[PDB]
Ligand binder design. Structure first.
Ligand SMILES: O=c1ccn([C@H]2C[C@H](O)[C@@H](COP(=O)(O)O)O2)c(=O)[nH]1
Ligand SMILES: O=c1ccn([C@H]2C[C@H](O)[C@@H](COP(=O)(O)O)O2)c(=O)[nH]1
Ligand SMILES: O=c1ccn([C@H]2C[C@H](O)[C@@H](COP(=O)(O)O)O2)c(=O)[nH]1
Lengths: 142, 141, 145
């Protein structure tokens, strides 16, 4: 059993993460996460908040996970890459998820709140069984 | 066991992917795949087709896999990167494998059909035992 | 059981890699590795020595591993990425570990010996139990192909 737990920690994030349990019977490897706020990314590095806390769980024990770009993140009009290639998230991390995005182009680029630039992948690439979206006013699973 | 299945879907790819069963006795993690056509990559983003449908299986069940650059993809002359860092291929995908390649340089660069710019890695990084190259003109479930 | 074995190749690297056994009680996924020598990264591609030989074992058998950038690597003032996204190190490789690093800026950037720009992650993302730092002079069969 492999589960993700996602809690919105801002009001804008709540609009995109209503409390619910999401099944994954397409058996996709990655869990899409929203920008949750409109962004204008400057040329060079941008530190982008994802407005969520995340835990991943495998065989009933907390595990790590990985942040990977979606194939739609980079388009002809916005040359965006993840600076660290993929984001490596240790099981012990209990802060807010963040992204280091490099705008490789010469002009700023617009991102809309509803877009999913990245996807989360469990340690070991295990297919998620459930994705639990938690209430903002809830003690994040310890 | 962990096995890949590669089927060429163009005549170009067929020249590079004759039907065969390949063993991986070096026990390398990645499966090198050809460009299968001579390309010129423009500065910035390029869409590059790999001319193949691919399936991966672990313990008898279809699974996903990943597309990673090979170390030789990026040289001083050809400053090339995969736009998405690594390509995440879901078990359900049955389309042609595609690449988004950024030419970070200032001028177009030539890719030769025989070059393998990327390699495929099974979900969970399992070492492949067999790489099965299937015939083009055959519908496989 | 997942264990890393790291042997420094040079005397600069030995200063950062005295022999020891490191326990991973935080259960972090990656193993930080030092630059071990100051370096200037020119604009564009750079091939960088890591000054170490590395082996990974899972359940008593030699396995592969992966090189990933740390969040430390790229800052607003030094736009640095791993050319290959992540480095894929096969069990049959037995040389010195290398990095392909792209300086995306138009000026040389300086890296210091002390910094850890990348981390090693076992095949399958297994959490390391021990990181064994080996003596420099000796010749270990565990690094065999
Ligand atoms: O893309 C990333 C990468 C890391 N982290 C968090 C999770 C890690 O456990 C922690 C420390 O990462 P490093 O600075 O050591 O890379 O930062 C993110 O939020 N996003
Ligand atoms: O580099 C890539 C990444 C993805 N895909 C295919 C397989 C995926 O299942 C599908 C969607 O990928 P994402 O948008 O989730 O990254 O596109 C590729 O062909 N090449
Ligand atoms: O970042 C890297 C990537 C690879 N290698 C070594 C280990 C691999 O087994 C070998 C061949 O790599 P490829 O050419 O297959 O990418 O080079 C490195 O030292 N650093």
């Amino acid at each position: 059993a492999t589960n993700f737990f996602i809690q919105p920690i801002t009001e804008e994030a709540e609009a995109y993460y209503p409390p619910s349990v999401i099944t994954n019977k397409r058996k996709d490897l990655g869990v899409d996460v929203y920008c949750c706020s409109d962004l204008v990314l400057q040329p060079g590095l941008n530190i982008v908040r994802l407005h969520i806390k995340v835990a991943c769980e495998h065989m009933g024990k907390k595990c790590g996970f990985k942040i990977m770009a979606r194939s739609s993140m980079c388009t002809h009009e916005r040359l965006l890459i993840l600076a660290n290639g993929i984001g490596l998230i240790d099981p012990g991390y209990v802060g807010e998820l963040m992204l280091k995005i490099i705008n490789l182009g010469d002009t700023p680029v617009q991102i809309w709140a509803k877009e999913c630039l990245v996807q989360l992948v469990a340690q070991g690439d295990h297919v998620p069984d459930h994705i639990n979206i938690l209430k903002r006013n809830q003690i994040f699973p310890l």
